[PDB]
Amino acid sequence: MLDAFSRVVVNSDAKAAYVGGSDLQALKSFIADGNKRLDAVNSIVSNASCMVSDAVSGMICENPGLISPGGNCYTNRRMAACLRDGEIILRYVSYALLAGDASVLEDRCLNGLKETYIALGVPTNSSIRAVSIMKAQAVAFITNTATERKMSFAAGDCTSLASEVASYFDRVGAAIS
Amino acid sequence: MLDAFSRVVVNSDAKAAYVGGSDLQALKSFIADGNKRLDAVNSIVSNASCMVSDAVSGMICENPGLISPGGNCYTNRRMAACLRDGEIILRYVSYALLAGDASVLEDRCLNGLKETYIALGVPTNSSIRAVSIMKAQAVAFITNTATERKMSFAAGDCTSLASEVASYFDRVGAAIS
Amino acid sequence: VAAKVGAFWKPKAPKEVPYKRPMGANTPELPYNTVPRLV
Amino acid sequence: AKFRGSVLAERGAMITKAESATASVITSLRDGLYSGEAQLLTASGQRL
Amino acid sequence: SIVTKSIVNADAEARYLSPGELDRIKSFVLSGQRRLRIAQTLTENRERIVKQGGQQLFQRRPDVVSPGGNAYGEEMTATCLRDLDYYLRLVTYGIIAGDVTPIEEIGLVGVKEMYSALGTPISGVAEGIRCMKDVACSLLSGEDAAEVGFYFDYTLAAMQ
Amino acid sequence: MKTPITEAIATADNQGRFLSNTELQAVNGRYQRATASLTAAKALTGSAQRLITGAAQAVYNKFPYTTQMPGPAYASSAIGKAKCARDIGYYLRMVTYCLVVGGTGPMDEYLVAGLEEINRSFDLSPSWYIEALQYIKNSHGLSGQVANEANAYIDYAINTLS
Amino acid sequence: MKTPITEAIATADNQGRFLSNTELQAVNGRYQRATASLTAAKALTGSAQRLITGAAQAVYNKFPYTTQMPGPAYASSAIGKAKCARDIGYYLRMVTYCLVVGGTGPMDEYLVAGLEEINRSFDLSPSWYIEALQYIKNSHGLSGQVANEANAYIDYAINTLS
Amino acid sequence: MKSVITTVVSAADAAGRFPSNSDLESIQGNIQRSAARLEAAEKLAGNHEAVVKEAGDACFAKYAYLKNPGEAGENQEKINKCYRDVDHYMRLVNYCLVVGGTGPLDEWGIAGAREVYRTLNLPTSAYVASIAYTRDRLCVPRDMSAQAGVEFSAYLDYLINALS
Amino acid sequence: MKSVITTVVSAADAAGRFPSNSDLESIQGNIQRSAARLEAAEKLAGNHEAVVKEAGDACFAKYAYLKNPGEAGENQEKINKCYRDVDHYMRLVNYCLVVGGTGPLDEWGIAGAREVYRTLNLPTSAYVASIAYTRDRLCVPRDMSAQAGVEFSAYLDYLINALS
Amino acid sequence: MLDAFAKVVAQADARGEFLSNTQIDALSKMVKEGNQRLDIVNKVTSNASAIVTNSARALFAEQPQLIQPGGNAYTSRRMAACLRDMEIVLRYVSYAMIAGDSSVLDDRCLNGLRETYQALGTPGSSVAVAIQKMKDASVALANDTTGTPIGDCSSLVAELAGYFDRAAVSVV
Ligand SMILES: *CC[C@H]1/C(=C/c2[nH]c(/C=C3N=C(/C=C4\NC(=O)C(CC)=C4C)C(C)=C\3CCC(=O)O)c(CCC(=O)O)c2C)NC(=O)[C@@H]1C
Ligand SMILES: C=CC1=C(C)[C@@H](Cc2[nH]c(/C=C3N=C(/C=C4\NC(=O)[C@H](C)[C@H]4CC)C(C)=C\3CCC(=O)O)c(CCC(=O)O)c2C)NC1=O
Ligand SMILES: C=CC1=C(C)[C@@H](Cc2[nH]c(/C=C3N=C(/C=C4\NC(=O)[C@H](C)[C@H]4CC)C(C)=C\3CCC(=O)O)c(CCC(=O)O)c2C)NC1=O
Ligand SMILES: C=CC1=C(C)[C@@H](Cc2[nH]c(/C=C3N=C(/C=C4\NC(=O)[C@H](C)[C@H]4CC)C(C)=C\3CCC(=O)O)c(CCC(=O)O)c2C)NC1=O
Ligand SMILES: C=CC1=C(C)[C@@H](Cc2[nH]c(/C=C3N=C(/C=C4\NC(=O)[C@H](C)[C@H]4CC)C(C)=C\3CCC(=O)O)c(CCC(=O)O)c2C)NC1=O
Ligand SMILES: C=CC1=C(C)[C@@H](Cc2[nH]c(/C=C3N=C(/C=C4\NC(=O)[C@H](C)[C@H]4CC)C(C)=C\3CCC(=O)O)c(CCC(=O)O)c2C)NC1=O
Ligand SMILES: C=CC1=C(C)[C@@H](Cc2[nH]c(/C=C3N=C(/C=C4\NC(=O)[C@H](C)[C@H]4CC)C(C)=C\3CCC(=O)O)c(CCC(=O)O)c2C)NC1=O
Ligand SMILES: C=CC1=C(C)[C@@H](Cc2[nH]c(/C=C3N=C(/C=C4\NC(=O)[C@H](C)[C@H]4CC)C(C)=C\3CCC(=O)O)c(CCC(=O)O)c2C)NC1=O
Ligand SMILES: C=CC1=C(C)[C@@H](Cc2[nH]c(/C=C3N=C(/C=C4\NC(=O)[C@H](C)[C@H]4CC)C(C)=C\3CCC(=O)O)c(CCC(=O)O)c2C)NC1=O
Ligand SMILES: C=CC1=C(C)[C@@H](Cc2[nH]c(/C=C3N=C(/C=C4\NC(=O)[C@H](C)[C@H]4CC)C(C)=C\3CCC(=O)O)c(CCC(=O)O)c2C)NC1=O
Ligand SMILES: C=CC1=C(C)[C@@H](Cc2[nH]c(/C=C3N=C(/C=C4\NC(=O)[C@H](C)[C@H]4CC)C(C)=C\3CCC(=O)O)c(CCC(=O)O)c2C)NC1=O
Ligand SMILES: CCC1=C(C)/C(=C/C2=NC(=C\c3[nH]c(/C=C4\NC(=O)[C@H](C)[C@H]4CC)c(C)c3CCC(=O)O)/C(CCC(=O)O)=C2C)NC1=O
Ligand SMILES: CCC1=C(C)/C(=C/C2=NC(=C\c3[nH]c(/C=C4\NC(=O)[C@H](C)[C@H]4CC)c(C)c3CCC(=O)O)/C(CCC(=O)O)=C2C)NC1=O
């Protein structure tokens, strides 16, 4: 893994340059606006468990064939494992938001996950539907436009932060595809 | 029938494999939240009469065609029939929640239920609504989120069991759909 | 002669697991822009 | 018959023990034991 | 010998022989007569047993008598048959003793070292002993053959 | 070592190219020829001591002067007979190696390379070994392609001796 | 000419020896491999003008600039399209010759010997012919060892182009 | 199958009533006994081949008559069938150690065992000899804990009683 | 690389849990320490050729015998090889401020360096003399903030103790 | 240069003794695979340029220092030598795979490669990383059906990976 600070090192090591100027310009903003990123990851970790539960129930109330016998969500072990998997993906995308960088999201979960789900016979499009539901819940929690749930923040706009997790969830949804 | 411990031996018997320490911790986790499942089943069966009488009356008061003559819940005998026709459903979902998997209601209650209601002339989409109200009441009860009566519990999470009883309740929806 | 090693009373499992699963918290973290020479 | 009845169990146990030892030495032969150079220096190690 | 082994195992504990050990000694001295009969039958049919075992060995392991094999040539084949005769004699000793002490104290302790120093494959000796076991059990009754192969099996296990 | 495998590799390496279908067909010929050659190797292994003794006796019967003339080159004494049986066993071992290997690779490496040097210095007639190999060809007791494959490695040695 | 026959003869002549069993097994592999290759040659002969037209169309669809850019090297005019179809027919003919012959003997003699000289002077990219050969491999419609044998001569040409 | 939970749900179902307080009370007994039986299950599982080999070795030592011609063990493949036959029983009580009841034993090895072994001339005495030899070779320092050996031996002698 | 955020996240993955509200405080304290650490680093980046230039000749003024024939500063090419090597270490130090730890120094500039310098017969005292001149040329007025100088001098001291 | 059939004969002449029947059914079983082994080498030689170019591209997207000016992968000739050094090891791994024995691999490919790379200043660990990336793509490409009968090939791809690891530890 690399955070945003490490990544301007390893892209300017590869150039043999000194870090400074325009790439230190973006490190300046991290040490500026990290309070917004902190309210962001707090708005994820205080809501995470309801997020994966609502996501898998939305997937099941869209497609009942997984809960039918012969489905992948049928029985005691499989649906608990699916809850576990969705929460793990949620945990990694929350880290990738907190780092401002998607390297560990590749290296620790997205590396070789699609072939694993093919080898287990896991249907892909249902999990794509699930992570899109998590993406909608994440941007709803980040715009503070949760119709059911309220936290108080210092006033201001967090559009860039909201945009960042959409790129990350699309990275997950494309890497599983 | 089959419980959660007996679900993994019929999976391992298909490959002539010994159940070993690679899949035993999913069982030990299931044992670790034994008291959570146990208090949840108790919270379901404690207030079960209002659970049934509220759900059938809520199914009535949205579709008042059943009370009209020619309705399936018209006369006094058929209303006495319908009040137990869903109490049996709740009685078997309480079995499936305790046993840990949906095998005890699948061949005992759900096997043959579709053509019974077809041959009798029971409106299936009304019974869909009647069991969805029961699902909503169940997730209200075992999360201790009922605004109508509160029960005392030890603090912690119970959503893993709340998705379980949700996945039991659309199996009753899918089987007469 | 008559070497009974292991479970001689049966043939053995078909030996197939041709998939890679994401290592969580256990991927061997190596250094960037370099090669671990020796150790 | 009375004499065989007593010795059957111990005879079977000793045979089981012998073949246990043999299988153990076969696998530690295959797994690198007895091929370190401290073993290959002695002449009984060379015979093995 | 069963009597000897019972006496030592009781001697280490500094006690007389318990009634179980005496029971077993009694049962042994009572069966000594059929033990001697079985030893008779195996003893005086030694030529056919060694010959037919040598055949089954040489047909199962042609390499040992192939050109250059350990038992290659007239003298080496004679020496191998000599070894098979040694082991048949030891089996008769063990049958009369009622226990593998004679077989194990003579011919089993350090057999791997000896045969490795001689350049002989121990698996070939095991094959020869198995062939002799089949040939010898062919000449006995059911219960007698069962009791007699009891010692060939121990000799094979020790010779792995 | 001349196998059908190694010559295919040597032809691919001479062009410095990958293994074409030519080499794969040359290897496949070895594979569906091997089933009879492995039977020939088993059968020549099983009948070995008998064939060596019979071949030595046939050489002594054809050339009786080898058991009578004094000198180190002849089998007049006991060590001479032992070395004669050792040489016949060497020939049979090379024939079996060429059978299991699938070509005249072992015996080209072990027997005929520098063979007549020995027969010229140690004064040994190759006709003796020809007479032994003719007995082995006549008396192995094989049938079909097993016989066709064992005989084909026997007369290669005969052709090199002549 | 690289056949399984001529390489066996070349290995026997290099030692200056007669044909051993090694060479006979190498020839026998050709003989019980030939039955599927002759079917592959018949089938690629039958589907020829369809496959050539489809391969040219697939190259034009993958690289649309070849039909638009002016110049002699491109198929923007009619003679350029005629020469492109002629080249694809040349490749298919060499593949069929290697199929019936039993090795990469014809196309080593006729196609790849001095091939990049032409592509460098005439300025024709090898990726076009790679794209044509991938279509021919995907669209010949064969099954089993017929497909395994035709594809194995197709990707040899692909490997030499890359 | 025949587990602890599947009696208390079938009794409440045959009575046609909700899971009552005593039904809630019997699942608590799993929480105290699973810690003893699951560790017995995987020390059985990680040492099963060796256990099976010992069991196979025991009956032929006791009954060497069945290696005669015309018997249950004629050639080597029938002895392999015998080792497979007893490895199945060792797998089934591993299954009953994890379930909590004797559910996987009954309909998988026990129900129907009386006819096959009578019709295919297989002596049950040689089965129970190999099972009983595995039973009495249990001890507290080496094999397992104090409470693992208890019901590990109890699932064994249940099979011993059912085969006889 | 051990880094600003990355040390916490990787410790909160090894315990397999979501970031703790303790673990958003170490992130917050590491972000506030890196304000100073970036300040010094951009001064190093915007002005590096002058300080490398004035630090390189400080070595040759101390060790004038390197310019002798047969020594490691004999040519003109061996001179600006040394001036390149000093700039490499200043670029690696400029990383460790923007990196926030001794990562790039340990990996790309210290590992195996002593054996290479011994093989080429370069005196490591010469490589530490230029850095030791660079450290005490610093002034907390007019060069950078006083909070910057302690981190800058700390990484310089790490490099001096690693080389020597 | 030996094949796997040659190896048991070269150990049989040494003791001066005939192959016993257990070596013979060890060899007939091996032969009885036969078609699988050549299916494996057919799959690797059909895609050799793709394996080599994708492994080199992953190597330089990973380690950019070799193509950096001054790197060992610098200059039109050094890249051309690096491109087909990997193709040499791929060729000799396929030779050893069709032979059933790593005798041609040790003798002409790995013999003296280490001090060859030392005398040039070539970093042997990066060569080993390139060998590992060719190995991963070769075992990935080896176990697909692609119009072959279904079966298990596991004991053959283990040997194929073992040849690659033998090449990788000997270079560095
Ligand atoms: C991925 C490329 C890696 C790399 C390759 C590299 N090699 C060289 C130079 C040579 N390599 C050899 C190797 C062989 N010669 C042989 O005959 C065989 C068959 C067994 C092998 C493996 C030789 C002789 C040379 C020197 C000749 C030359 O190439 O001009 C070079 C640089 C060329 C040079 O040193 O001038 C490279 C770049 N090095 C890497 O960085 C990669 C890890
Ligand atoms: C028939 C099955 C079925 C369900 C189970 C739910 C599941 C569900 N929830 C949301 C949508 C959402 N889900 C949440 C999550 C939560 N809201 C909170 O306040 C809690 C803290 C947390 C757990 C309950 C949020 C915040 C939204 C966005 C706002 C909203 O639409 O309510 C969406 C829309 C996502 C999208 O596609 O854009 C769906 C399908 N809806 C369904 O149709
Ligand atoms: C580091 C990151 C990381 C992950 C994301 C998971 C990924 C993952 N999931 C599963 C395993 C599984 N994953 C699922 C999940 C699902 N099946 C579905 O139908 C749904 C789409 C989805 C849940 C919403 C199921 C049901 C299994 C079990 C399949 C089985 O029973 O064999 C496995 C195999 C091991 C196992 O069986 O437990 C792995 C590696 N593990 C990791 O280490
Ligand atoms: C360690 C835990 C930790 C946190 C959780 C944050 C908490 C936090 N947030 C802000 C401060 C802020 N936080 C936000 C963020 C938002 N405001 C909104 O209305 C949006 C919903 C959301 C966008 C994602 C904004 C806009 C400010 C004010 C400007 C700023 O300081 O970034 C501040 C400084 C001013 C204040 O005290 O309020 C602090 C301490 N910081 C921390 O140190
Ligand atoms: C073991 C599982 C089990 C069950 C689930 C029930 C299922 C069931 N329900 C009914 C029978 C019935 N079930 C209903 C129920 C309804 N009709 C409606 O309009 C509503 C949608 C719904 C009530 C909420 C009615 C009204 C009848 C009687 C039909 C009539 O005679 O008018 C019958 C026929 C027997 C009888 O009529 O006495 C059966 C078998 N019984 C079981 O033994
Ligand atoms: C049209 C006519 C009409 C009715 C008859 C009532 C019936 C009714 N109740 C609930 C909804 C509910 N009903 C209950 C039931 C109970 N709560 C308790 O504490 C008691 C033990 C028990 C009955 C006395 C619970 C727990 C909920 C969940 C919502 C909540 O907690 O308030 C719902 C919504 C179901 C859903 O959300 O999908 C409806 C329609 N409401 C109506 O609109
Ligand atoms: C005779 C009937 C009877 C029962 C069935 C059990 C119920 C019971 N529950 C808990 C204990 C608990 N029970 C819960 C469950 C919950 N807490 C919530 O906030 C949710 C509403 C609900 C989840 C559905 C939790 C979270 C604990 C503490 C952690 C745990 O032991 O699981 C414990 C103690 C175990 C412990 O905490 O160490 C017991 C004995 N007791 C009885 O006497
Ligand atoms: C799921 C549980 C399960 C089992 C317990 C076994 C039970 C079992 N064993 C055998 C079959 C057998 N079982 C034995 C075993 C023995 N005979 C002896 O000499 C000894 C007494 C004993 C071994 C110690 C033998 C030898 C056969 C083969 C008998 C025959 O084929 O004639 C068969 C007939 C099918 C077959 O041939 O395999 C069955 C059902 N199989 C199962 O599927
Ligand atoms: C899970 C079930 C299980 C078993 C029953 C045993 C079965 C077993 N026991 C022994 C081996 C042994 N078993 C014992 C017996 C005992 N040892 C003591 O310290 C006690 C006094 C007594 C408990 C009964 C002894 C003394 C040996 C060594 C000598 C011998 O082989 O008999 C061996 C030979 C090698 C070994 O030790 O593993 C095996 C396979 N192993 C298992 O995995
Ligand atoms: C981070 C930025 C950084 C630097 C700019 C340099 C340090 C540095 N110092 C000076 C130059 C100087 N530096 C000092 C500073 C001091 N001398 C004292 O007497 C005091 C003890 C101490 C701090 C007050 C003085 C007095 C000069 C002389 C003024 C001048 O030459 O311009 C110069 C330019 C003139 C020259 O090269 O000669 C440079 C490049 N090192 C660094 O790491
Ligand atoms: C030019 C060289 C050349 C060849 C290699 C073969 C190619 C080939 N292989 C097989 C036959 C086979 N090929 C495979 C191989 C595989 N199956 C899989 O699923 C894996 C992906 C792959 C393992 C690497 C297997 C497993 C068989 C035999 C089927 C079996 O044994 O059950 C057959 C069928 C005839 C037979 O079974 O013998 C043929 C013609 N023929 C040739 O002329
Ligand atoms: C690699 C395979 C191989 C072959 C082929 C071989 C032949 C061989 N035979 C030899 C001698 C001999 N060979 C014979 C054999 C015979 N002479 C007779 O009269 C008989 C007719 C005939 C036996 C059939 C005799 C008697 C000697 C001893 C000659 C001497 O020492 O002068 C010698 C001289 C070295 C020695 O004294 O052993 C060689 C090298 N050696 C080998 O290692
Ligand atoms: C032995 C087998 C054989 C091959 C392989 C072969 C190739 C070949 N193609 C040529 C030209 C050509 N080849 C093409 C083909 C193409 N250009 C495109 O833009 C298309 C994408 C593609 C068609 C698919 C064209 C357009 C020319 C004419 C180029 C020119 O004249 O400058 C020429 C130049 C001589 C000539 O004008 O004909 C040769 C030698 N010739 C042979 O005899």
Side-chain angles (χ1 to χ4, degrees), chain G residues 102-117:
Chain G
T104 86
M107 87 195 312
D108 276 349
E109 284 325 328
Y110 301 140
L111 195 122
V112 277
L115 181 61
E116 60 88 15
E117 279 51 11

mmCIF file of all heavy atoms in Angstrom, chain G residues 102-117:
data_model
loop_
_atom_site.group_PDB
_atom_site.id
_atom_site.type_symbol
_atom_site.label_atom_id
_atom_site.label_comp_id
_atom_site.label_asym_id
_atom_site.label_seq_id
_atom_site.Cartn_x
_atom_site.Cartn_y
_atom_site.Cartn_z
ATOM 1 N N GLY G 102 3.012 -32.276 -43.084
ATOM 2 C CA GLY G 102 3.248 -32.811 -41.762
ATOM 3 C C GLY G 102 4.262 -32.072 -40.924
ATOM 4 O O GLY G 102 4.665 -32.586 -39.876
ATOM 5 N N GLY G 103 4.682 -30.890 -41.342
ATOM 6 C CA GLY G 103 5.588 -30.090 -40.543
ATOM 7 C C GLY G 103 5.636 -28.692 -41.102
ATOM 8 O O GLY G 103 4.996 -28.376 -42.109
ATOM 9 N N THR G 104 6.433 -27.852 -40.448
ATOM 10 C CA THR G 104 6.612 -26.475 -40.897
ATOM 11 C C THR G 104 7.770 -26.426 -41.889
ATOM 12 O O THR G 104 8.760 -25.721 -41.718
ATOM 13 C CB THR G 104 6.854 -25.539 -39.725
ATOM 14 O OG1 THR G 104 8.249 -25.523 -39.412
ATOM 15 C CG2 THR G 104 6.081 -25.994 -38.509
ATOM 16 N N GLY G 105 7.633 -27.216 -42.937
ATOM 17 C CA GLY G 105 8.589 -27.279 -44.012
ATOM 18 C C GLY G 105 8.280 -26.345 -45.163
ATOM 19 O O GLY G 105 9.156 -25.603 -45.612
ATOM 20 N N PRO G 106 7.050 -26.393 -45.701
ATOM 21 C CA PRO G 106 6.696 -25.433 -46.752
ATOM 22 C C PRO G 106 6.738 -23.988 -46.317
ATOM 23 O O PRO G 106 7.367 -23.184 -47.008
ATOM 24 C CB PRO G 106 5.279 -25.859 -47.137
ATOM 25 C CG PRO G 106 5.283 -27.286 -46.929
ATOM 26 C CD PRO G 106 6.124 -27.536 -45.732
ATOM 27 N N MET G 107 6.121 -23.628 -45.193
ATOM 28 C CA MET G 107 6.044 -22.211 -44.878
ATOM 29 C C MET G 107 7.373 -21.658 -44.391
ATOM 30 O O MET G 107 7.634 -20.480 -44.620
ATOM 31 C CB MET G 107 4.919 -21.933 -43.883
ATOM 32 C CG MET G 107 5.261 -22.052 -42.432
ATOM 33 S SD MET G 107 3.756 -22.116 -41.453
ATOM 34 C CE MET G 107 2.861 -20.742 -42.157
ATOM 35 N N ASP G 108 8.257 -22.501 -43.854
ATOM 36 C CA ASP G 108 9.627 -22.061 -43.617
ATOM 37 C C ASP G 108 10.357 -21.771 -44.917
ATOM 38 O O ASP G 108 11.239 -20.911 -44.959
ATOM 39 C CB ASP G 108 10.401 -23.096 -42.813
ATOM 40 C CG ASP G 108 10.176 -22.959 -41.341
ATOM 41 O OD1 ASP G 108 9.598 -21.938 -40.924
ATOM 42 O OD2 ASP G 108 10.604 -23.856 -40.592
ATOM 43 N N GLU G 109 9.995 -22.461 -45.992
ATOM 44 C CA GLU G 109 10.694 -22.260 -47.252
ATOM 45 C C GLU G 109 10.098 -21.104 -48.030
ATOM 46 O O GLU G 109 10.807 -20.397 -48.752
ATOM 47 C CB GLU G 109 10.638 -23.541 -48.081
ATOM 48 C CG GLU G 109 11.557 -24.725 -47.701
ATOM 49 C CD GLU G 109 12.953 -24.405 -47.158
ATOM 50 O OE1 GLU G 109 13.585 -23.391 -47.536
ATOM 51 O OE2 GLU G 109 13.421 -25.192 -46.307
ATOM 52 N N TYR G 110 8.802 -20.896 -47.892
ATOM 53 C CA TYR G 110 8.070 -20.017 -48.779
ATOM 54 C C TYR G 110 7.617 -18.722 -48.143
ATOM 55 O O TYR G 110 7.442 -17.755 -48.866
ATOM 56 C CB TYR G 110 6.839 -20.733 -49.356
ATOM 57 C CG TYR G 110 7.176 -21.988 -50.122
ATOM 58 C CD1 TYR G 110 6.395 -23.130 -50.008
ATOM 59 C CD2 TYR G 110 8.290 -22.036 -50.944
ATOM 60 C CE1 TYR G 110 6.719 -24.282 -50.694
ATOM 61 C CE2 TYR G 110 8.615 -23.172 -51.637
ATOM 62 C CZ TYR G 110 7.830 -24.290 -51.509
ATOM 63 O OH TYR G 110 8.168 -25.422 -52.204
ATOM 64 N N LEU G 111 7.450 -18.650 -46.824
ATOM 65 C CA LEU G 111 6.841 -17.481 -46.217
ATOM 66 C C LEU G 111 7.770 -16.748 -45.259
ATOM 67 O O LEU G 111 7.895 -15.531 -45.354
ATOM 68 C CB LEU G 111 5.551 -17.880 -45.499
ATOM 69 C CG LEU G 111 4.624 -16.726 -45.137
ATOM 70 C CD1 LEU G 111 3.265 -16.922 -45.764
ATOM 71 C CD2 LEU G 111 4.519 -16.642 -43.622
ATOM 72 N N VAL G 112 8.399 -17.432 -44.307
ATOM 73 C CA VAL G 112 9.074 -16.682 -43.254
ATOM 74 C C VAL G 112 10.536 -16.413 -43.563
ATOM 75 O O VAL G 112 11.159 -15.579 -42.892
ATOM 76 C CB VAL G 112 8.984 -17.394 -41.899
ATOM 77 C CG1 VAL G 112 7.671 -17.071 -41.252
ATOM 78 C CG2 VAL G 112 9.146 -18.835 -42.058
ATOM 79 N N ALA G 113 11.103 -17.098 -44.543
ATOM 80 C CA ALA G 113 12.497 -16.890 -44.910
ATOM 81 C C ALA G 113 12.599 -15.562 -45.637
ATOM 82 O O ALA G 113 12.180 -15.434 -46.781
ATOM 83 C CB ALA G 113 12.999 -18.038 -45.770
ATOM 84 N N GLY G 114 13.141 -14.559 -44.964
ATOM 85 C CA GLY G 114 13.215 -13.242 -45.548
ATOM 86 C C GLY G 114 11.901 -12.507 -45.577
ATOM 87 O O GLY G 114 11.645 -11.757 -46.524
ATOM 88 N N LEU G 115 11.067 -12.674 -44.555
ATOM 89 C CA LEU G 115 9.740 -12.075 -44.559
ATOM 90 C C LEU G 115 9.765 -10.630 -44.087
ATOM 91 O O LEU G 115 9.081 -9.782 -44.667
ATOM 92 C CB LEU G 115 8.782 -12.888 -43.688
ATOM 93 C CG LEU G 115 7.332 -12.404 -43.603
ATOM 94 C CD1 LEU G 115 6.676 -12.411 -44.963
ATOM 95 C CD2 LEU G 115 6.549 -13.253 -42.634
ATOM 96 N N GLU G 116 10.545 -10.330 -43.043
ATOM 97 C CA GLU G 116 10.478 -8.993 -42.474
ATOM 98 C C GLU G 116 11.192 -7.986 -43.357
ATOM 99 O O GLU G 116 10.968 -6.789 -43.180
ATOM 100 C CB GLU G 116 11.059 -8.968 -41.046
ATOM 101 C CG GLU G 116 12.515 -9.385 -40.888
ATOM 102 C CD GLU G 116 13.454 -8.196 -41.080
ATOM 103 O OE1 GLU G 116 12.952 -7.042 -41.046
ATOM 104 O OE2 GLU G 116 14.640 -8.402 -41.366
ATOM 105 N N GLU G 117 12.053 -8.456 -44.278
ATOM 106 C CA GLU G 117 12.662 -7.597 -45.289
ATOM 107 C C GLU G 117 11.597 -6.924 -46.125
ATOM 108 O O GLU G 117 11.674 -5.723 -46.420
ATOM 109 C CB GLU G 117 13.537 -8.407 -46.251
ATOM 110 C CG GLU G 117 14.961 -8.794 -45.855
ATOM 111 C CD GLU G 117 15.172 -9.468 -44.488
ATOM 112 O OE1 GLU G 117 14.230 -9.896 -43.790
ATOM 113 O OE2 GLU G 117 16.350 -9.587 -44.105
#
